[PDB]
Design a protein around this ligand. Sequence first.
Ligand code: CLA
Ligand code: CLA
Ligand code: CLA
Ligand SMILES: CC1=C(C/C=C(\C)CCC[C@H](C)CCC[C@H](C)CCCC(C)C)C(=O)c2ccccc2C1=O
Ligand code: SF4
Lengths: 161, 73, 60, 163, 166, 40, 741
Amino acid sequence: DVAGLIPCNESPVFTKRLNASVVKLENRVKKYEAGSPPALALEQQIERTKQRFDRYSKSGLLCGKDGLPHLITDGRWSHSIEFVIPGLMFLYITGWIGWVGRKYIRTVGGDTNATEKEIIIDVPLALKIMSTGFIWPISAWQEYISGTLLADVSEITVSPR
Amino acid sequence: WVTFYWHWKHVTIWQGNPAQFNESSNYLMGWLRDYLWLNSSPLINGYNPYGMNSLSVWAWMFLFGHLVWATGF
Amino acid sequence: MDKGSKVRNLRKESYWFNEIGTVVTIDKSGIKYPALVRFTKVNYSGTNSTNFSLDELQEV
Amino acid sequence: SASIPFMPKPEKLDGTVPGDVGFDPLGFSNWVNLDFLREAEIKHGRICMLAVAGWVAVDLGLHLPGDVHNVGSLEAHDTAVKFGAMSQILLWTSIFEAISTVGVVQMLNGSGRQPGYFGFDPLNFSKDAASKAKLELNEIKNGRLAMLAFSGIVTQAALGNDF
Amino acid sequence: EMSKSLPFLVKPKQLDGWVGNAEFDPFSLSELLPMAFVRESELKHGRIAMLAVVGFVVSELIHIPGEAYQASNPVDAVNMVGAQPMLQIFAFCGFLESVFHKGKMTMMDMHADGQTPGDFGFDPLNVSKDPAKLAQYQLSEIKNGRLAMMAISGLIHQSIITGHGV
Amino acid sequence: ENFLKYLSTAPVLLAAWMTFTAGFIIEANRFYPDALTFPA
Amino acid sequence: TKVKILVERDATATSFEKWAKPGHFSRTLAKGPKTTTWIWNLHADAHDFDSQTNSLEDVSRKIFSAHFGQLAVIFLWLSGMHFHGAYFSNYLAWLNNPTSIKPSAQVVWPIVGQEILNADVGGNFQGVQITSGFFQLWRAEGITSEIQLYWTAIGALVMSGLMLFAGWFHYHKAAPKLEWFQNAESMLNHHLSILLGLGCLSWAGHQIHVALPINKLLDAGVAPQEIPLPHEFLVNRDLIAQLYPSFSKGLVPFFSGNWSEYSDFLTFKGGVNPVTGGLWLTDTAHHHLALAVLFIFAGHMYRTNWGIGHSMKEMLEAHKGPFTGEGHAGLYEILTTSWHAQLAINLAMIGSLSIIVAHHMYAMPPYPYIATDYATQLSLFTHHVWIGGFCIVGGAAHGAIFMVRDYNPAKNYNNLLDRVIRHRDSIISHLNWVSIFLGFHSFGLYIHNDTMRALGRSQDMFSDTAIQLQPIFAQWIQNLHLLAPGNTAPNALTTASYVFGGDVVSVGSKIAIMPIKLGTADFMVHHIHAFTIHVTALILLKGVLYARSSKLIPDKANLGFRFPCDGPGRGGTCQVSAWDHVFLGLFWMYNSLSIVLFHFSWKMQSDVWGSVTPTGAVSHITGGNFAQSAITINGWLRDFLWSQASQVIQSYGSALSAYGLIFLGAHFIWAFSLMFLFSGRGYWQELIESIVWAHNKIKVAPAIQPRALSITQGRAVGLAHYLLGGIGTTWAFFLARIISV
Ligand code: CLA
Ligand code: CLA
Ligand code: CLA
Ligand SMILES: CC1=C(C/C=C(\C)CCC[C@H](C)CCC[C@H](C)CCCC(C)C)C(=O)c2ccccc2C1=O
Ligand code: SF4
């Protein structure tokens, strides 16, 4: 439903696209003997195309007048699968990365050779830190409420501030 | 970017096949082919060895603008 | 204030403004900017020290 | 110079390597670690002794119960790679070879490990009385013999069935 | 002064005061990580392998009414639909891991003061009577845990290739 | 020691880690290809 | 014995300690990174040996071993090419039916749908069509089997290993002393008599004994299976006597002096082989034999250890006339005491030679079935043209580097270098005038034609049907080359190339090579080429001459080779160094070579490449629209770029879709380069300051302080991305335009 979109399960244009892909692959494979490595590769491509289209039909995506799936990203829970769920994953992964990185910066920073430890990573310490990122949200919130996340106004600035 | 978007959408609407934009505006090759390459044919043909037409002045100005743009570099 | 004491910079034009630097030497022989200070970070010129007047340093 | 009496007295040789007789015309040892060479020679010799034993064993005898073993030694590699036993033996030999690579690196660094020391004496054929040096000379010599013999066997069987 | 399990390597250090002191560490991963955390991980993997091997053997013997019957476990777990049960058990496992670790969640937080690896109290059976018997049982636990890891890996993969793992 | 320290340099570690990330991403796309949207 | 071998044993210890201390080579970078600029410097001064040690011996030992490393890399590349031919290519199928089967030696894993790039080349094979002409090269060598390709790859791998070992050995174990390097006479003798003389002799032997009979059998229609192995042509002489009944006599004619008896397989017919469309193998065999003789003779010219020979020092000192003061006095010291001078000469010569190779290979296709492979011809021509331009500009840059660093006025008193530096103003002023004259006249011809065509005054243009500018001199030279066979080259049966005149050589209904007529469009485009070349020479020569000093900066030499500026004083002093002259010369070289490649592509598509009918009618790719459309800028824009860009833009959904993707990516990178080219460092430094404040506010602050790219690095990055984008755009354009065939 949403913005005049008909589900791809009952989209004639979607089926026409599937048929066009399959038929063009078949025309391509018609110039190879059955069982030839090229023929097997093309048959596997045909099977993969059919599986992709079937998965799209079964997933619940919304098709347009052009027959291609369209994504709804207004927060609709029924369409969270399109954007909300992966987004969270991203914000987790990157979060992890970021947090881990920050920790390393603040771990080797209290040394005379802090610079020398950035071109040359301390792999043991680096992996120690990297293994701790799965709780990055909790640690980040604890630091935020504990005042150890942000620096005070007493930091570098410019003539007009 | 804004003027390209306006012009291509309106051109497709005027031609009577707005589906072309809806299809080809999702990837950049569509912009390069269906808008710049396709719609410049009546322009670069302002004057050819076979003859010339009313658009010859616009083709000359087209090449002139290209030259000035390059000279800026 | 004294040799080896940390001082927060107050020179507005300085590359290490609002930063902590260690005092290296202090000239008691008059001079307008007698307090030599050294910072961890190098400025754009590659130097990491400068002379300041005691009025341009917050003590700690 | 030993054996070849007109060669230039092999350098950095003798005093070690029970199997040595002083035969180093090219003398690679001078410019490369002797420990690495000893390890390479011993490993080649062991592998090839097993190879000779296998080739003679495959010679119309001791075939495994599977039907695929009606096949002969020459075609054994192909039938094994198709059957996948070859890939598995590759897996296990690779595991052993990595664990031994750590040891080779340690030996080169100066860990004090002897070239072929793998502490493998289940029936401890070796004894202080037996004399490890006497036991090794035979090991190294029969290993070199097996190296050359297997090379010959495979080549002249690729020519015509040795037996 | 020389290795025991692999008598062609130098005996790794930082491996003495530990129950599973068979002196096996060719790639020296112990030197790369804190011993306490990684041994605790050994304990966890071993315990999970024990539970999994027992659970796979039992399932191929008896089942639960209406939870699917007479099928290989790797196939039955796939046959669960909607992820309704697996998420429940996942949350329960997280609950218990949090309870046991007392909030010292990650490796750096873990082993804060003592946090002896894989203790978590929970020893109602009379133990800690003497270091001798306790260490004997601990060594038994480690050996059985490693055996369980190998057994479960084998059972699950052999079920994958075949139909029924046994 | 020296060889491992060299392996710890920024470019070597970046190359190794990016190769690892590309590898596991490629494998994930190989086993679950054409993953526009999440399974129900 | 003045020439002798001198080495130092165990010159350098082999250890990894240095590998963990990046920047050890330079004294400034060895202190560790304070800012990110350090990082960039470490990759910029890595191979600047001259700036790492003050001793020439150490620089020489580094250069020798780095050359060994380069040879190892090249051998590894050859091994990879040959191995992919043996295991991943359709070489056998192409051998059987070269005309229809499309060469391909690369296969793509199906991982994201990229398997579409596996084209239906033919021969029951799918892969990426290659345009490196390796199949034609291998056929010319009479490979005829994949075992031979496999063993070629194995040998290449072993040779790469040997090159690596030689580099290591000649640095760390036996490093030749400086006196060993400073042997120009001995080095030239050894490189001419053996490297180039015996190389030619050995290749001629291969051709006579391997390539000739195998290719003759292949041309006769013998299937590769029935062709006996090449070694079979070395044991039984009669087996070769059937093909060339002059072996029967053996080697006795060679020593008796009756070389005429070898005319069976040592011919001078020239032209092109009608069957394969390439040069006759016997012609190439005689060619390489003659070159081997000449190189061996020339390798005995220089005096090494026995009195006889030439001393190049005396040779140079002797050549001096009234107009040039001391003549070539002091050039030998320059070329034996500074690697930059030698590198400048060698790079200039290699670049010019690469361009000559590109010009000669298309006109006289040397390999079988390469002429009709339009995709291969175009790719090889453009590749070698680009390589030549890059090498020429590099020679200019290193000449400037020599002038800044290794130039010593004390040893260059009133010699050629001194006098050139002393009338540099006149040289540059006249080069400027000739550049302006060429630009005005040549490009204004195009502008005039465009204006007249836009105004409808077609009778006032510079066209064939209008005011005519016929390249009369080029036409006269073409006529003389046409008439050469039998009159000025009596023993040559056919002209050197069919470009000048003659029949239409077509293979399998495709026009392999045909005469190229020169008209007014050719005149205009040739003068455009001359204009661009003159401007590039202006820029680079000005950079070289004014590298040490100028009326702006009398002491430029003290500032170094590459420096950003000398401040905003004296008006402005931006891009005043010789490095910046190279920076601009690279742009102009890219422009000129782009024009050259467009000229070649359009001319060949419109006038040479095409198809023939059984009667003999010719139908070219674009219908001969070059004469009346290559005379206006709008004509180039419409009939060449817009018209021939259809393949790239429409390649989506086919095996050539990769070319469209690369077309767009090259456009993107080219546009991206403008960000560095136009902008300056201060803006980016301030933006980075704001971003660093943002990082610091969260207690994230790298110890290595971030820095905006230096001015010189900004220019270098802009130029590199500009060149990559342009080259990639034309690469995709040509390959997709010439692979849709
Ligand atoms: C771990 C290091 C780290 C952390 C925590 C952050 C965090 C942040 N950056 Mg910074 N940044 C970093 C590295 C880092 N950055 C690097 C290496 C670059 C150079 C390419 C930049 C360039 C940069 C710019 C230009 C901007 C930010 C901005 C921001 C903020 C928004 C997030 C964002 O735009 O990311 C953007 C991230 C990038 C563009 C590149 C990140 C590249 C990798 C993924 C990060 C380095 C990971 C590294 C391998 C750590 C390894 C740890 C291991 C040794 C244990 C946030 C404060 C923005 C800001 O000011 O917001 C207010 C902004 O405008 N960053
Ligand atoms: C025989 C060939 C040859 C040799 C031996 C040298 C050697 C040298 N040159 Mg010369 N040079 C050459 C050819 C050569 N050059 C050519 C052909 C040009 C014309 C462009 C130049 C232009 C040139 C200039 C302008 C300068 C040098 C400098 C130097 C010195 C330092 C080089 C360095 O540190 O590398 C560092 C190498 C790099 C940082 C690698 C960068 C490589 C490019 C930018 C990227 C390549 C992209 C790749 C091909 C495709 C990418 C694909 C993409 C999709 C990823 C050194 C003496 C410098 C100097 O001061 O010497 C005294 C200097 O200022 N050279
Ligand atoms: C397409 C844009 C463009 C144009 C037209 C020019 C033009 C020129 N460049 Mg520039 N250049 C450009 C782009 C361009 N460049 C870019 C992008 C770069 C960056 C790399 C450079 C970098 C560069 C350098 C580094 C150098 C030049 C040089 C030259 C001159 C070559 C000599 C010449 O042809 O004089 C003749 C002039 C023309 C052909 C311009 C067209 C004039 C037409 C034919 C006639 C115009 C009508 C007429 C004037 C009517 C008058 C009346 C009217 C006012 C009403 C010329 C001034 C060189 C130079 O100045 O030394 C010789 C030089 O050294 N250029
Ligand atoms: C954008 C820009 C910058 C800022 C650009 C910077 C700091 C470069 C940033 C490089 C990043 C951090 C590395 C990663 C880049 C790519 C993701 C991949 C690596 C590319 C090569 C380095 C291998 C300048 O400093 C500058 C200076 C002078 C003139 C023009 C400019 C200019 O245009
Ligand atoms: S703008 Fe840049 S290059 Fe020009 S004078 Fe100023 S600092 Fe130097």
